[PDB]
Amino acid sequence: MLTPEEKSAVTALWGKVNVDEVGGEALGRLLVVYPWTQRFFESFGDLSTPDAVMGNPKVKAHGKKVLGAFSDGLAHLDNLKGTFATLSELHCDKLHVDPENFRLLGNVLVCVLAHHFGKEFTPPVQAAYQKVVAGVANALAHKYH
Amino acid sequence: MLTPEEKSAVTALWGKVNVDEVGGEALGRLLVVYPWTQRFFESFGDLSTPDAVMGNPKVKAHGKKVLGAFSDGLAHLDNLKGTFATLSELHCDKLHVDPENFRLLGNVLVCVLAHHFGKEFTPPVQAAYQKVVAGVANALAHKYH
Amino acid sequence: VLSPADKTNVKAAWGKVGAHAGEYGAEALERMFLSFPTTKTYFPHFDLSHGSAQVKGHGKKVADALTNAVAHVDDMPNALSALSDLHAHKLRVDPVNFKLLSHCLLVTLAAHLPAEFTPAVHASLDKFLASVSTVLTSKYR
Amino acid sequence: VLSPADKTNVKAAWGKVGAHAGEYGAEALERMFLSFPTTKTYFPHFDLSHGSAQVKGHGKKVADALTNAVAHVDDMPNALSALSDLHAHKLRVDPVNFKLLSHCLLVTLAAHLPAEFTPAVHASLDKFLASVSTVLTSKYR
Numbered sequence: 184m185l186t187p188e189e190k191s192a193v194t195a196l197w198g199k200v201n202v203d204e205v206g207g208e209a210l211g212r213l214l215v216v217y218p219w220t221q222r223f224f225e226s227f228g229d230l231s232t233p234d235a236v237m238g239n240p241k242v243k244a245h246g247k248k249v250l251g252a253f254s255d256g257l258a259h260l261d262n263l264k265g266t267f268a269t270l271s272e273l274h275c276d277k278l279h280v281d282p283e284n285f286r287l288l289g290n291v292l293v294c295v296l297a298h299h300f301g302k303e304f305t306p307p308v309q310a311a312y313q314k315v316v317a318g319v320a321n322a323l324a325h326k327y328h
Numbered sequence: 329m330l331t332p333e334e335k336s337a338v339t340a341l342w343g344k345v346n347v348d349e350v351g352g353e354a355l356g357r358l359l360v361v362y363p364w365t366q367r368f369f370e371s372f373g374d375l376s377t378p379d380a381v382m383g384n385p386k387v388k389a390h391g392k393k394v395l396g397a398f399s400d401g402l403a404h405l406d407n408l409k410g411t412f413a414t415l416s417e418l419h420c421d422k423l424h425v426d427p428e429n430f431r432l433l434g435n436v437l438v439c440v441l442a443h444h445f446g447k448e449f450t451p452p453v454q455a456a457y458q459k460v461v462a463g464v465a466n467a468l469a470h471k472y473h
Numbered sequence: 474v475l476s477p478a479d480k481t482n483v484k485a486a487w488g489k490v491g492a493h494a495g496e497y498g499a500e501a502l503e504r505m506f507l508s509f510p511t512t513k514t515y516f517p518h519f520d521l522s523h524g525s526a527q528v529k530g531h532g533k534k535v536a537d538a539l540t541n542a543v544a545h546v547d548d549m550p551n552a553l554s555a556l557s558d559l560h561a562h563k564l565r566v567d568p569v570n571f572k573l574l575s576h577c578l579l580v581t582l583a584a585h586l587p588a589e590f591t592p593a594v595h596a597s598l599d600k601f602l603a604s605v606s607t608v609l610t611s612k613y614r
Numbered sequence: 615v616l617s618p619a620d621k622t623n624v625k626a627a628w629g630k631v632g633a634h635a636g637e638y639g640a641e642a643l644e645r646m647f648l649s650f651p652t653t654k655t656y657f658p659h660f661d662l663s664h665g666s667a668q669v670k671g672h673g674k675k676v677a678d679a680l681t682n683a684v685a686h687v688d689d690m691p692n693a694l695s696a697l698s699d700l701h702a703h704k705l706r707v708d709p710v711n712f713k714l715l716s717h718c719l720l721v722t723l724a725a726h727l728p729a730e731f732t733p734a735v736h737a738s739l740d741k742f743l744a745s746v747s748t749v750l751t752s753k754y755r
């Protein structure tokens with residue numbers, strides 16, 4: 184759904200991303216900025232404070248899987264649905280994750296990206312990344328029923 | 329667009345509809361339930377009260393053209409984009425209407441269908457309809473840039 | 474903010490709902506689940522099949538709550554505090570879903586009150602559901 | 615509701631924006647127009663190209679508005695009253711658009727405050743922006 188220039192803009196920037204580091208930050212930020220999302224991770228332990236959250240081992244671990252999976256989709260930006268079909272279904276059928284959350288995440292992510300990249304995460308790159316996240320959220324919600 | 333079973337319900341009810349009547353009611357309640365939507369109709373004259381609005385003849389004319397267009401739409405549940413293309417563009421480039429207005433309407437419309445049809449408006453027909461208002465809204469936003 | 478008129482319209486229409494409310498709650502529910510299927514993510518512990526004791530008992534608790542908000546439209550916060558606590562701290566239902574239920578609630582209303590559902594009552598109930606939604610979501614963070 | 619921590623966070627970070635606000639205003643808009651092109655529906659009269667003083671100028675206005683809010687954090691409604699009127703009765707900008715610009719603001723804060731943009735301040739800012747949003751659309755109906 185992205186133009187030639189936006190695809191170039193997304194790929195390039197993802198090159199510089201330590202998926203693990205970003206992954207834990209985003210997942211951690213979700214949990215701090217929208218505390219209700221903590222509803223799916225009662226096992227994860229202490230989520231009592233920004234701090235506890237941010238340094239919790241399971242957040243970071245989980246955050247890594249997520250973005251690892253996110254990374255796999257970047258690769259297939261033209262089959263965004265096909266790719267997340269199995270995940271769409273699992274989040275629905277077993278996790279019972281309101282697709283809304285995927286949207287909170289994409290935004291929190293964009294935030295993380297920007298924080299980390301400063302002046303490099305320009306209006307145009309953000310634009311390209313707003314499309315990607317949205318595309319990802321929709322792909323993951325696609326099998327909800 | 330929907331299951332055959334779903335189109336059938338959809339086309340079935342609309343069979344029993346007065347496009348002009350519903351037109352005007354839908355447009356009107358939109359203008360009353362969401363006053364901000366009025367921004368586009370300041371040449372429609374008097375809109376100072378719910379009565380003014382519901383009574384306004386232009387709102388009434390407007391209501392029927394939007395809704396007849398909607399009606400042509402129902403015949404093309406398998407190509408809403410094909411159908412709404414140019415109309416999406418104009419809304420975009422000439423009218424400058426925020427696509428959210430399309431969702432507000434869609435919502436108002438179902439409300440209108442429910443009041444008008446009572447119990448024949450079962451949850452399932454509702455659903456079917458929700459898909460169609462979602463669909464058409466999606467299709468008019470579609471050429472926005 | 475619900476002006477006096479709004480308050481008038483709500484109590485008026487709510488009144489007519491009378492002792493149907495609970496079964497009103499139960500249809501609004503069923504209407505959300507079938508129309509907005511994502512909302513079922515919050516109800517995996519429920520038999521969500523038509524006429525469930527669960528849904529009916531639930532639609533019933535919902536209505537009771539609204540009857541309470543209406544009974545106390547001037548002090549929704551304290552009237553609903555207990556429930557804003559539980560919604561923020563236990564159920565943590567994303568706030569987008571409040572709106573979906575407000576919607577199906579309007580639909581339920583519209584279809585059961587052919588006389589009372591004028592443009593101005595419609596307007597008023599809308600503002601009011603929007604308000605309930607807010608009280609309940611006020612303590613989310 | 616803005617807790618004492620939230621106000622501190624807000625004032626702290628807003629403090630740092632210092633005289634950058636206007637610049638951050640314009641950038642924020644620009645982020646919005648490119649990220650959420652539906653938002654352009656409201657500025658057909660504006661030159662929306664990069665560098666447009668028009669954007670700059672509207673950018674300035676917004677930031678100063680946001681500055682006033684922070685200054686009057688405990689008295690937003692009256693602080694913003696003139697602007698809740700203008701949006702409600704004249705601009706009549708759909709409420710959903712206020713969340714897009716909110717995110718864009720956050721985004722811009724992020725990219726210019728790597729030290730200050732902690733998870734805690736990120737939280738406060740979202741909160742505060744949501745509050746500003748609420749106050750600006752408070753009189754829509």
Ligand code: HEM
Pocket residue numbers: 220223224245248249250252253270274278280284285286288319320323
């Ligand atoms: C782009 C967005 C997302 C992607 C790609 C994604 C992907 C994944 C993957 C791959 C797993 C399974 C890990 C494995 O392979 O073993 C997983 C599990 C899970 N995800 Fe998602 N996820 C996303 C967003 C979300 C969000 C926003 C939430 C909730 C706020 C969430 C909640 C969960 C939970 C609760 C589990 C189970 C973890 C456990 O066993 O404790 N995910 N996700």
Ligand code: HEM
Pocket residue numbers: 365366368369393394395397398415423425429430433464
């Ligand atoms: C189902 C949704 C809708 C459909 C199918 C639709 C269809 C139409 C059509 C066919 C026209 C052609 C008029 C012309 O050439 O002047 C039109 C114009 C217009 N529409 Fe839409 N529309 C819809 C929703 C809306 C909504 C929700 C609003 C706004 C708040 C809106 C505002 C307008 C305006 C201001 C015009 C111009 C009328 C004129 O020039 O006389 N429309 N619409």
Ligand code: HEM
Pocket residue numbers: 512515516534535538539556564566570571572574575605606609
């Ligand atoms: C009109 C706004 C709402 C009102 C007034 C309302 C009210 C209530 C009340 C009174 C209860 C039961 C409290 C108790 O048992 O003491 C409840 C439980 C619940 N509500 Fe809400 N609710 C609303 C919106 C929502 C929405 C939109 C959802 C989900 C999409 C939701 C999900 C739940 C769930 C999952 C439960 C608990 C399940 C159970 O008890 O077995 N609520 N709500």
Ligand code: HEM
Pocket residue numbers: 653656657659672675676679680697700705707711712713715746747750
């Ligand atoms: C907290 C968020 C917002 C704040 C603080 C804000 C504040 C302002 C201010 C201070 C002005 C100029 C006031 C005057 O001239 O007296 C203004 C004008 C305007 N704003 Fe808002 N605004 C916000 C959000 C938005 C959004 C989201 C939109 C549309 C996406 C919007 C559209 C406009 C427009 C179209 C004007 C008129 C400018 C012109 O054409 O001359 N505003 N706003």
